Amino acid sequence: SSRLGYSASFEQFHPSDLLRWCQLAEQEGFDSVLAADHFHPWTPEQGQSGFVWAWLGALGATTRLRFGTGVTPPIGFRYHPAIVAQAAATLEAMFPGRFWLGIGAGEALNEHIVGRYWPEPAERIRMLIEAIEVIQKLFTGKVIRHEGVYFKVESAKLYTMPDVPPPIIVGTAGPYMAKKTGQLCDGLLTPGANDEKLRLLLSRFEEGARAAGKDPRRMPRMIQVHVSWAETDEQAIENALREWPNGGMAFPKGDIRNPEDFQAMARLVRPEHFQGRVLMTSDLDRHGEFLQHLIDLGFTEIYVHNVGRNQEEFIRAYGRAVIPHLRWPADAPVAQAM
Amino acid sequence: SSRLGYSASFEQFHPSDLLRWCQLAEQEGFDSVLAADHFHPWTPEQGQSGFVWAWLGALGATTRLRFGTGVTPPIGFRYHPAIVAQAAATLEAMFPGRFWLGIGAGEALNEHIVGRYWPEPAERIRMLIEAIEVIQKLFTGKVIRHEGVYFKVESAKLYTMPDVPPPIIVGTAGPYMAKKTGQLCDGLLTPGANDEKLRLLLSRFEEGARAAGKDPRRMPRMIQVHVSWAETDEQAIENALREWPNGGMAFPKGDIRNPEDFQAMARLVRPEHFQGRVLMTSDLDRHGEFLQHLIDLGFTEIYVHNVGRNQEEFIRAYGRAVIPHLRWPADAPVAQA
Amino acid sequence: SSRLGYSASFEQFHPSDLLRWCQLAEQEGFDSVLAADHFHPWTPEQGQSGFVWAWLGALGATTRLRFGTGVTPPIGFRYHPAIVAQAAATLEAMFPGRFWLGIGAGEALNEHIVGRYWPEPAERIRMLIEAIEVIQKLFTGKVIRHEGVYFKVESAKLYTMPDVPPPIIVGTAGPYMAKKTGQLCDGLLTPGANDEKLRLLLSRFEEGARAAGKDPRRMPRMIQVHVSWAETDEQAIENALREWPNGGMAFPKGDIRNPEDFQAMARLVRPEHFQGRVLMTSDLDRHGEFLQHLIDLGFTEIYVHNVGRNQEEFIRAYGRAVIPHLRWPADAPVAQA
Amino acid sequence: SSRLGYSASFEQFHPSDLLRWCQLAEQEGFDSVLAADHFHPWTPEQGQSGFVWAWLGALGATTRLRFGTGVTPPIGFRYHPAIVAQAAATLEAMFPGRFWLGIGAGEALNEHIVGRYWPEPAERIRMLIEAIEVIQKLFTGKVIRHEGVYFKVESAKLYTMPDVPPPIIVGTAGPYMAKKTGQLCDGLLTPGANDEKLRLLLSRFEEGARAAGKDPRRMPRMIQVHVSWAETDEQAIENALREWPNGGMAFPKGDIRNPEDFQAMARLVRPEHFQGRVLMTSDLDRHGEFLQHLIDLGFTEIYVHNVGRNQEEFIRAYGRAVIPHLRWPADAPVAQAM
Amino acid sequence: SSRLGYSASFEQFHPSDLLRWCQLAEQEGFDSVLAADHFHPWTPEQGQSGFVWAWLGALGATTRLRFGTGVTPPIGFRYHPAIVAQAAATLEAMFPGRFWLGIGAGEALNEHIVGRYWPEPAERIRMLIEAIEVIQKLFTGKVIRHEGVYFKVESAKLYTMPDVPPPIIVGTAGPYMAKKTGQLCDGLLTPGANDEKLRLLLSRFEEGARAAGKDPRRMPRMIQVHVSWAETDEQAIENALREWPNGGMAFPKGDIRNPEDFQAMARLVRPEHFQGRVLMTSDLDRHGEFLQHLIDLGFTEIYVHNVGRNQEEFIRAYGRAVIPHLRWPADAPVAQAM
Amino acid sequence: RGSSRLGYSASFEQFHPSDLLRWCQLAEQEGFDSVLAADHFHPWTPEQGQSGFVWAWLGALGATTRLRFGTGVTPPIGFRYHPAIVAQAAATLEAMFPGRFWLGIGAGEALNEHIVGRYWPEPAERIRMLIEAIEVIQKLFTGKVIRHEGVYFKVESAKLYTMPDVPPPIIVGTAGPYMAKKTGQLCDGLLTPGANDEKLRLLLSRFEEGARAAGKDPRRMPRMIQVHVSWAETDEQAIENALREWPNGGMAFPKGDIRNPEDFQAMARLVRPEHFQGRVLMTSDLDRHGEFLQHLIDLGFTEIYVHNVGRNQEEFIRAYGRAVIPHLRWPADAPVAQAM
C-alpha cells in the first residue's frame, strides 16, 4: 500500500543515470516515474535533454514501475499527434498496465526549434483538444481520417495496440483546461501550487468529469512537486538556486525560447521566490508532512523531483524516512489502463 | 570472427516478440539488429507497426547487440530531422558504440498520414541531403541555426550527446544517392539485388567517398536481404507468398499509401516474382552460400529478414548451421562510432 | 432503334487515327463517342495522350455523333472548373444536342504533373462536388461569384452558351458518389464490373435522384466496357496483355504517378486477372450477349473500348455482327441536353 | 503570291459564325486565322467568348488555313503551361504545318476569374519567360521535370507530338519582351501602333535574335490590326464606337477585371481616340495602302480584325478589292513549323 | 450657426501648404477638415501624397477645427485595423471632441504597393466589416483577442484612450454598405452624386440604423463635394480638367494601380463628364445654392474640395460670400464624440 | 566646446501624449534640443499605463516646437508597419519640418509586434528583415518609381511624391555588434541603450568599422545613446521611482520575445535595486547626473537622450535645465542626427 512517484529530470541528468536511479527508486519503494519530454534544459547549467521515448523503452524493459510522460505536447511542433498515439500504443502494448500518456500545451523552449508560429496559450489549448481527438480516434484501432482546424490525418490505423489503451492525462495549471481534462480525458496532472489554486483545479476537473457523466473518484489526480533535500538546510537552499532557478520564476514561461534566456533571468532569483514552489530542507519529517498534506487535498499520486544532483542519496533518504509513513486512501485510483 | 545481422520486421511482429527474438538471436551468434521504422505494415495480414524508437531503448537495455534504424525518413513528415538527431544522440549516449542511424527518403505508406504534398523520389533525395546537414550540425553539440529550402531550425543544441556521434548510414538503391552517401555520410545500406546492381551501388559509394578525401575501405557497406527458411521448400514458398508479397513486387512502391492497396496488389504475386529478391528454401547450405556470395562482393554486414512467422526456429537454424560457416574478412568495418 | 457507343482511347491512339475511326464508327452504326481526358497513357507501350478538348471540335465538325469526355477532372489540377464549364458550353453551343460533360475525381497519372498535394479519394469527391457547384452556377449564364473550401471564382459569366446546357455526367464506381450523382447531376457513367456492384451503383443513383425529386427513368445510366476482339481467342488475349495490362489491375490506381510505374506493374499481369474486366474472345456472339446483359441490367448506353490496335476491323465486325442484334428499350434516355 | 490573315474575334462572335466565316475567308484568299483566347468579352455588347481550343479543332478539320492563338497566357491562371504545351502539340500533330502557338502575359479581364494575386506586367513577363521554358522542355518529347519561381512540373512527357513542334510566337508591345522573343522564341506578334513604336519593336526583336545566333530574316514578324470597313465612312465610324470602344482606350488595360468596367469606360470614347488604332473608312483603296505600309515596315503577316458585325461583307470586299493588290516579298517567312 | 467643411487634398498639395490653408480656413469660418489618406495621387500632375496621420497631429495642435480621415482603409494592406484603432484613439485623446475616424474599402492606387491579392469590392466590404469589429473591440479599452476570416489579433489593449471614443464614419457610395454603416457605425460619408443616388444612400443608412434600434436623426450624414471656383468660368473649367480628371471618370476606379494609368485615362475626359460630380463656375451664388440643396436633402455636414491650385483665394471667397449664407438646421448632428 | 544641449526621451509607455507634448515644449525652453520618441503599441507594464501612436504625436511636436526629433525606434519589418509606410511617414515629417527629423529604426519587440498574430523570428532573422527594410526605405527615398522583391517584402510600383529636398537620416537602434557594423555600412547613424563601457566601445567600434569599409567618414556620423535615470528630491524617492515605474530597467536579459504587459508585470516582482546598476542612475545629486552624462560624451557619443523614469517629469526637466545641461561639454564639431 506504500508508494510514491519519482520525477525523472531530463533537463538535468544523463539518461543512463536516470535509468540507474529509477531502478534504485523501485528498490526503495517508489512505484512510478514521471519523465519530462524536453528538447532543451531550462539552463545550460542543468545541461541535458534526452529523447524520452527511447529512454522509456529501457525503463520498461528493466523495471516493473509504472511510468508516463510529464508531459508531451502532441500539437504538431516537435511531435505530430498521430506519432504520439503510435508511441503511446507501442509502450502500453510492450508494458501493459504500466504506461500513462501525459500531454500538455507545450513550451517554446522545446517547440521553437521547428521555426513555426507559436500561438497564445488559449489557442494552444484548442490545438491540444484537437490533438486529443486525433489520439483517441487512433486508439480505437480502426482506420481513421481526420480534418480539423489544426491537424490533417489521412487514412491511418494503429496495428500495434494494447488490449486496452493507456489513460490520457493532461498536465495543466489552467482552470479552463482542468475542466476540459475531466470532460475529455482520463486524469489530471498539475504542478505544486498553493492550496487555493490546487482546490480550484481539482474542483474544475471534477465538474468537467461529472458534466460528461464520468465518476471523478475513479480518475487519477496527480501532482508533480519540486523539493530540495540535502544534508543541511543551507545545501538544500543552494541546490535549488543553482539547479532549478526556474522554480523561483513565478510568471508564465511558455514563450521563452532559449536556455540562455532563462539563464540570464536566473540571476534575479533569490530563495524567497521558491516559497510554495520548492520545499528546501534537510528535515525529512517536513518532507513527509508536505506530501501528506497533498494526499489530504485529494491527490492520488505524487511525483517528486529533488532538484539537487544528490539523486541517489535523496532516493535512499525518501525510501527510509518518507515513503513508509505516507498514508494513501486504500481505493485511490492510479494512472493505468482499465 | 563469426557474426550476422538480424532484421527485426516491425511490419509483421509484435514488439514484445521482436524483443525476445533479438535476445535469442544474440545467444545464437547474431551481433546486430536492423529495425524498420514504420507507421503501417505493407498489408493487414502482416498486422503490426511498433514505434521503433521506444523499442530500441528496450533492446539497448537488455542486450549487448549493435542496432540501427533501417531506415528512418528524417525529412519532416512523421519526423523532423532535429528530433531524429536528438533520438540518435540519446540512444548512442545510453548505449555507446552500439547505435547506427539509418536514414532514407521514406515511403508514402508511412508518411502520408500527415496529409502533405509527397514529392517525387529525386526531390525527396534533395530533402534527405538537407536533413543530413541538419543532423550533422546538431551532432557538433553547438547551438546551431539552419535555414534551407525544406527545413528551418531555430537556435537548437543537443545537450545529451555521446562523446562520439553514431554513424549516419543511408539506405538507398539509387546510384546517385549511393555516391552522395559516400560523400556526405559514414556508410551505405542497400537491399538485396542482382550482382550488377550491387556492384554499381558499391562503386558509386566508393567513388563518392574517394572524391571527398575519405577511405571507403573503412566505411560500412551493409545489405538487407529477405529469405524464407522453413522445414520444407514448399512451406518456405508459401510463407513468402502469405507474409511478404511486397517482396515479389519488382516496381517502385514509394507512392502507395494504404496497406489495403498493397493487399490488393498482392493478389497478383506468384513465386516466380521473388527470384533474386527472396531466397526460398529449407536447405541451410544454400542460405550459407547466398550470404557468403554477398560478403565476397564486398558487403561488410548482412541483415537477414526471414519472412516466415517461424522466427525462433529460423534464428536457431541459422545459429547452428549458417553463422559459424560464414567467412568475414578480419578487418571489415562495422557500423559503429 | 440500333446504336452503340465507341470508346476513343487517347492513351493508345493518335488523335488523327481516332478521328478517322470515329467517322467510320458512325458509318457502321455507332451513335456516340466517349473520349478519355488524359495527359499521360497508362504505359509507354500505349504511347499517346492527345488533348481531348481540341480533338472534340474536329469530331463535332466532321460527324453527327454524340460525344462526351470520359472523364474530365474539373478539380483544379490540370483544369480549373470554370474552364471546363466554358469548354463544355462552347462545345454544346457549336454542336447543340450532341455533347455531354463527363467528370470525375481524377487520377494522379494525369494530375500529378502540376506538383500539388494529391488528396485521398473521399477528399477528391468533396472537391468534385464543389466543382459541380461552380459549373452549374456558370451554366446559369449569369455573372456569378463562388467561394468554397477548394475554389474561388471572381465575377465570371459564360457569354457563349447553348440555349440548354449539356448534361453533367459523373464517372464513378463509388456507391456514395453514385448517390450524389443522382442528387446533383444529370446521369451516371461507370466502368464494367460484376453484376452485384453494377446493381448497387444503379440503385444508389436512383435513390439519390428520387430523394431530390427527380425521375431516374429519364436520366442516362451509362457504362464503359473494355473488350478484346480479334481473329482468334489467342490474339485477343495477347492484345489485352500487351495493350491494356491496367485492365488486369484489380486494385485502386488513382495514386500512381508515372507510365513507367504501371509498366513495371504490368509485368505481373496474366490473363486470369482480366476476368469480369475485359472480355477476350473472337466470338462476336459472345460480345453480343455480354452487351445485351448490360442493357438488361438497366444501362441505357454502352461505350465499348476494344483494347487491340485492330480498331478498324473491330468497328466493322461490331457494325456487321453485334450492333444490329442489340435490343434497346424504346424509351431509353440518352446523354444529351 | 496573294494572302492575308483573318482575325477571329471571340469577344464578339458566336464560334459557329466564326467557323463559317473562316471557311468563307479561305475561299476569298485569306490564308491564316488568328484566334483570341478569352474567357470574357471587353463589353457585354460584344457578347461572346468561346473556348478557343475546342474551336480550333473544328477549324483545323474543315479548312486548310494556318491558324494560331492570339494569344494564350500560359502563366498558370486559366491555363497551366504544361496544358498549353499539350494542346499545341495535339493541334500540330493533327494539322501538321498549320498551327502556331501565340502566347502572352495575359489580362485580368480573363485571368481574374480564378481569384489569385495579379502581378504587375514586368512580373508577368518573368512568368511568361518561365512558361516558355516549360513549353520548350515538353516539346522535346522527353520525360522532363521543372522547378522554378512560378511553376512546378513533375515527371511529364508529351506522348502525342508532331514530327516538328509548332513555332512559339510571343504577342507583346513591350521592348524588353520583344528582345526576349527574338532570343527565346520563333517569332513576334504585335498590335497596330504608330510607325515609331513598330520600328522599335522590330529592332528589339532583331537584336535579340542576333545575339542568340539566329537569323531574324527567317523569323515571322506578325501584326494584328483593327479596321472598320462598311458601306459608308459614317457607318464605319459608328461600328468602331459601338463594337470596339476598347480600340479607343489608349492606356494600359491589363488590370481591369470586368466587362462592366470597360462598358462604363466606353462611354468616354470618341472617334478621335481611334486614330492610329482603328482605320475607319469605306474606301478599300485606303485599306490596301494601310496594309501595304505595314508590309513595307517589314511585317511578314498581317491579321485583320474588322470591328463591325458585317463580317461576311468585309471578307468578300477584302477578297475582291484588297487581297489581290497586296505585294508580299517572295521569300517572306510565315508562322509554321520547320 | 455658420460653418462648412474644408477638404484637404493630399493628392494635390504639399502638407505644409495644407496646414497653412486649414489655419486660414478656420479664420474664414470653416469648422472642420476632411483629410484624404493616400499613398499615391491619382495623377503625377497632382503630384503629392503626405502621410495623413502625422499631418493630423500638426492640424490638431495648431487649430480648434474638427477633422477626420476621408477615408482610411483599415483592411490590412497599408494599415492593420489595430494600428488604425490606436492612431484614432491617440488623436481623440490628444484633441478630445475633434476627431472622427473615416474608413472605407480602399483603392488599389494606394493598397497595391504591398503586393497582395486585391479582392473584388464585395469581398473588401466583408473585410471592412471585420475591421470595424476589431476597431470597436479595441475601443472598449479591454484586453481583446480576435480571430476572423481576415484578421488575427493576439492579446491587445489600447492603454492611451479618450474618455469617449471618436465616432466611426464609413465612406461609401454603395447601398448595401450604407445600410451596414447605419447598423454598425456612427455616421455616413458619401461623395457628390445626383439626387436619386443620394436619397437612396440616406434611406439605406436610416433603415440600417433603425433596424439596429438607433436614432438616425442624431447620426451624422456627411457629403464630400468637388467644386471648381476661379475668377472666370473658363479658368474653373480648365482647373477641373487639369487638376481633377478623375472627377470626370464615372466608372469604378478601385482596381487601377498606377498614377500613370489614370494619367493616360485622363486624356479621354471632357467638361461634360463632370456634370453632377464637379461644379465649375466663378458665380459664388451658384456655389451657395448647390451647397444649400445638399443641406436640404438632409446632409448635416459638407466637406468642400476646390480642385484648383487657388486654395487661398477659394477659402477667402467662400468665407466672404458662401459660408455666412448657408442655413443649417439648429439640431443637426456633427461628427464628434457623444 | 560646442553650444549647450541634451536630448529628452519621451516615454510613451508611461505618459499621456498630451503630457509629453507639454513637457517637450518645456524641455525646449529649458535647453533640451531634441526628442527621442518611443514607437510602442503596449507599455512594458500596466502600471506604466500608456502607448500613444507616435506618428500622430510627432506632427504636433513638429508644429509647436523647433526641436529635432526622431523615433526611438520604429520596426519597419512588416508587423505593425510595412517599410513603405514608414518611408512615407518619415518623408512627410521631414518635408513638413526640414532639418529636424531623424528616422530611428530597429528589429522590434514581440511586446508590440505580436498583436498581428504572425511568426516571430529569432533576432538574427529579424536583423535580415531590418536590412531588407532599409533597402526598401532607401529606394523610396530616391523619389523615383521603384519596385522591390526580396525574401521578406514585395513592393509594387511605388513612389514618394511628398519628399523633402534631402532625406532624413536613417538611424538604427541596436545593441547587437553585427547590426552596429551594418548600421555604419548602410545607414547614417547609431542609437544604442546605456550599457557598460566594454559593450559601448564594441558597438562604437563595429559601427566605425562598418562605415569605414563602406568608404564613409564615421567622424561625421551621429553616435547616439539613450539612457535611463531617476532623479528626485531624495535618493530614496529616486530608487522607489525606478522600481515602481521602470522595473524593465532591472531586467538584464533579452526581452524581445515576451508578448504581454502582464508578463513583464509578473517578472517585475523579482526586480530589486541592485539589478539597475549601470542601467539606471538613481540619485538626487545632480552633479552625479552631470558626470554620468559627461563620461558618455567622453567615450565618443555625440548625442544623449535622457529618460527620467519618475512621474516628476516637469521637475526633472527644470532641474536638468538649471544644473546639468549648462555644464555638459560637447566637442565643437560633433555630428548631430539631421539631414545633410
Ligand SMILES: O=P(O)(O)OC[C@H]1O[C@@H](O)[C@H](O)[C@@H](O)[C@@H]1O
Ligand atoms: O510550474 P512550471 O514552472 O510551469 O513547471 C511545469 C513543469 O514543466 C515541465 O516541462 C518540467 O518537466 C517540470 O519539471 C515542471 O514542473
